[PDB]
């Protein structure tokens, strides 16, 4: 009766979606073939797979997501790898020529020829499900497909389905390192679409994942194949209350109203804790207070900002595991006592909790330990304006010499969108400072 | 899916083309007979990018090879790999140019191009989605430079929405083996800089010092020089042919390397270059790759980046690796060497990751870097062209074939305004 649909865009999206769906296989016990194991001859244990996996009369479970990318090379590893029989032959959309780190190639010239093919399967996955909350978007700012094609996908989806929910997990550019050069162009020019054609948008920074995975899990030199496990661990704790039973359930509609106070303010921030190794797990006791303190600690913060310099507007607790509600209230009443953490004076109740019973599972070869309880943050704070300020300063000095303009003008779009995208943000940063100003 | 049409011009272009197709045939596991003799299965996924399918399980390259003398097709077919090139792809005339850009650009290269266009059209339309073309020729001789710059001036109008790569051989002041090559160079670069997308500079001075000092050899024949230039020339299309984490083809490198359409000159380099007596002693780890590369002696051009500014740089890596160390090391050299980078553009480094190394190796790196310091070599040949032309000598080879005298003036006027554009960023 409940279903969820995920749309993963770009090379970032198709690579985090592989680790996202292998965990979904392991929570419901789905083998890479696509069924219950043949050792178990009677099944249908609980209809928690109905929201993530389809049902066929032969006993096969098919996922309810779609993968889109303009690069065929990273897509066909799913066709070649272990999970070839599990994923549908149609649910993985393949391009022919990549956008090549550009916005106009992904938007106006190549994004048009495949925007109708995906929408057919989006409609096909929409009438399968009786009840749909909305769509999850796993896209990247720096990618050509994740910027250009997404800036037409969210626009067309908003008129394809009016009041449907729209959640985004965006791979935000890191403030120090980057794999490209023209990523401020790819980041700014897609913000004009996403500020009006999205409901909620969590940001993920890779270099903050780099330090967190290094200093906490005691694993030096990580790889993307384990970062996507961490991001895939975040996605399961959000949708845990939908699938699994809990003391009180949080919907996909519950936190989209409790983290977005203004239509121009829809940028929360994610944080996961505890993140410890197997060797560190058994020495340290893991209390509810000791896992909620690291969440509010800016050292464990997953986007490279500081709430000490900023101020929160809203937060969201995702408690999953062996947790009782008594010390949850003792923890959050203790959080309200420290004056180092500062809230705004107009949102005196900034808490929403969600309780799930089943502790998180672990994967063979993964980095995280077998843990009994965990908590995920979805907090909205104004410290992102610190990150936006240093992103536009780089954008303004890069545009002052009119570099890389010929890569965009000759593709078909006009040069007036460059000035508008800089100005529309400048009003948005003015909106960011005005909500932070108290009475 | 995505194909590459490979174009060669000149005797230098033929001698570099034999070794270039040697190492890819080694990399993709191809015998001198023509049949795949390998051990893996991922090596057969992206074969159509360079090899056309045939009957009997044979794969032949889609390369066009041109020259004006017949004395180079005999040596090309006499190579260890000459039995795999299809005999229809060779184009040769009955009379050469003989170190003259004028012979190949108006009179003798004018009739050859109408056959080469037929050869490239019957092959480029046989694919499904061509990524683009790639040139490798020499400016030091008019066989591949007089007419090779005319193929650039002809396929650009026919196939406009494509990428073209050139591995050009701009000459050198010490290994100058022709009197009149200042004329052959400047008259080629003037027609080059307007009608191409990506250019490198392969200088034989740089290859000579590398194999003498870095590789520590005694007799570096041209086969060793052709191996060093083709390691980078194959190391630029790694992610096109093999999967990885950060796939990056030529056009993804070009959009980050070309901020202005007249800024398309680069400085190639190759990291895993160590002597045989120093092979066991050195520990191969990605700080060592990014430290050996950024030295000025590894570069393939006859310029010094300490006299200029690193405008933008690229990096393509190979082998199964962890990107924590390479992202840390590229940030360290960016922070420490703050005076060698321009300040009007941040994040000047482009990163590409492939998980497959070449044979006999586990990790590798390829460098493509645009710098203001590359302008020094145009100044070296501008003063020599001015010195030769102000005495009004050697024009009887040139003005007697239909070239007006004002063509030398516009070749000066476009070139010195080009280096005046390069002057502002330093």
């Amino acid at each position: 009766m409940r279903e969820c649909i995920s749309i993963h865009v770009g090379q970032a999206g198709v690579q985090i979606g592989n680790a996202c769906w292998e965990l979904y296989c392991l929570e419901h016990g789905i083998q890479p073939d696509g069924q219950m194991p043949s050792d178990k001859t009677i099944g249908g244990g609980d209809d928690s797979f109905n929201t993530f996996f389809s049902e066929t009369g032969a006993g096969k479970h098919v996922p309810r997501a779609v993968f889109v990318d303009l690069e065929p090379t990273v897509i066909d590893e799913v066709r070649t790898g272990t999970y070839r029989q599990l994923f549908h032959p149609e649910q993985l959309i393949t391009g022919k020529e990549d956008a090549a780190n550009n916005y106009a190639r992904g938007h106006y010239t190549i994004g048009k020829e495949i925007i109708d093919l995906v929408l057919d399967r989006i409609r096909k996955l929409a009438d399968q499900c009786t009840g749909l909350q909305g769509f999850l978007v796993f896209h990247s700012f720096g990618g050509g497909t994740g910027s250009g094609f997404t800036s037409l996908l969210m626009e067309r989806l908003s008129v394809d389905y009016g009041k449907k929910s729209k959640l985004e997990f965006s791979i935000y550019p890191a403030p120090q390192v980057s794999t490209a050069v023209v990523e401020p162009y790819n980041s700014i020019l897609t913000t004009h679409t996403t500020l009006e054609h999205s409901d909620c948008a969590f940001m993920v920074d890779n270099e903050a994942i780099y330090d967190i995975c290094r200093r906490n899990l005691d694993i030096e030199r990580p790889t993307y194949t384990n970062l996507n496990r961490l991001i895939g661990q975040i996605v399961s704790s959000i949708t845990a209350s939908l699938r699994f039973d809990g003391a009180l359930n949080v919907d996909l509609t519950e936190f989209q109203t409790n983290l977005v106070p203004y239509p121009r303010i829809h940028f929360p921030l994610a944080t996961y804790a505890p993140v410890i190794s197997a060797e560190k797990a058994y020495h340290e006791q893991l209390s509810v207070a000791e896992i909620t303190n690291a969440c509010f600690e800016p050292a464990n913060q997953m986007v490279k900002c500081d709430p000490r310099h900023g101020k929160y507007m809203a937060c969201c607790l995702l408690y999953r595991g062996d947790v009782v509600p008594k010390d949850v209230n003792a923890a959050i009443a203790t959080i309200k006592t420290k004056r180092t953490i500062q809230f705004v004076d107009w949102c005196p109740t900034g808490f929403k909790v969600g309780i799930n019973y089943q502790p998180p599972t672990v994967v063979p070869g993964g980095d995280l330990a077998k843990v009994q309880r965990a908590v995920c943050m979805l907090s909205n704070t104004t410290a992102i304006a610190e990150a936006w300020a240093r992103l536009d300063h780089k954008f303004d000095l890069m545009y002052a010499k009119r570099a890389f303009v010929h890569w965009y003008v000759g593709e078909g779009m006009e040069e007036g969108e460059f000035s508008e995208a800089r100005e529309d943000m400048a009003a948005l940063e003015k909106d960011y400072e005005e909500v932070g100003v108290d009475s | 899916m995505r194909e590459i049409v490979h174009l060669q011009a000149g005797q230098c272009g033929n001698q570099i083309g034999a070794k270039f197709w040697e190492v890819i045939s080694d990399e993709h596991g191809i015998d001198p007979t023509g049949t795949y003799h390998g051990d893996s299965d991922l090596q057969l996924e992206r074969i159509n990018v360079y090899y056309n399918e045939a009957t009997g399980g044979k794969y032949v390259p889609r390369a066009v090879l041109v020259d004006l003398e017949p004395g180079t097709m005999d040596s090309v077919r006499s190579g260890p790999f000459g039995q795999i090139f299809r005999p229809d792809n060779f184009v040769f005339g009955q009379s050469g140019a003989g170190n003259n850009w004028a012979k190949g650009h108006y009179t003798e290269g004018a009739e050859l191009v109408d056959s080469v266009l037929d050869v490239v059209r019957k092959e480029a339309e046989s694919c499904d989605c061509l990524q683009g073309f790639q040139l490798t020729h020499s400016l030091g001789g008019g066989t591949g430079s007089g007419m090779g710059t005319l193929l650039i001036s002809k396929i650009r109008e026919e196939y406009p929405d494509r990428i073209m790569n050139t591995f050009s051989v701009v000459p050198s002041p010490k290994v100058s083996d022709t009197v009149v090559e200042p004329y052959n160079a400047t008259l080629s670069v003037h027609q080059l800089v307007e009608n191409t997308d990506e250019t490198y500079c392969i200088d034989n001075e740089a290859l000579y010092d590398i194999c003498f000092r870095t590789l520590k050899l005694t007799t570096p024949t041209y086969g060793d020089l052709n191996h060093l230039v083709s390691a980078t020339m194959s190391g630029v299309t790694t992610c096109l042919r093999f999967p990885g984490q950060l796939n990056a083809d030529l056009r993804k490198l070009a959009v980050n390397m070309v901020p202005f359409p007249r800024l398309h000159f680069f400085m190639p380099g190759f990291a895993p270059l160590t002597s045989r007596g120093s092979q066991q002693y050195r520990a191969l780890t990605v700080p060592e790759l990014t430290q050996q590369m950024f030295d000025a002696k590894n570069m393939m051009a006859a310029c010094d980046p300490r006299h200029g500014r690193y405008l933008t740089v690229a990096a393509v890596f190979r082998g199964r690796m962890s990107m924590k160390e390479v992202d840390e090391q590229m940030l360290n050299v960016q922070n420490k060497n703050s005076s060698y980078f321009v300040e009007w553009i941040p994040n000047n480094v482009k990163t590409a990751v492939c998980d497959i190394p070449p044979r006999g190796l586990k990790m590798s790196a390829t460098f493509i870097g645009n710098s203001t310091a590359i302008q020094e070599l145009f100044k070296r040949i501008s003063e020599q062209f001015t010195a030769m032309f102000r005495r009004k000598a050697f024009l009887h080879w040139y003005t007697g074939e239909g070239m007006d005298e004002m063509e030398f003036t516009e070749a000066e006027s476009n070139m010195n305004d080009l280096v005046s554009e390069y002057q502002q960023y330093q």
């Binding site: 030096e220 030199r221 384990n226 190794s277 | 160390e325």
Partner: peptide, 23 residues
Amino acid sequence: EFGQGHTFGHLTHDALGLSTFQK
């Protein structure tokens, strides 16, 4: 008495599959 890290290569490269616990 009268009556009678293993390798700096492993510590500086590729610790993702084998962490410090697995080293």
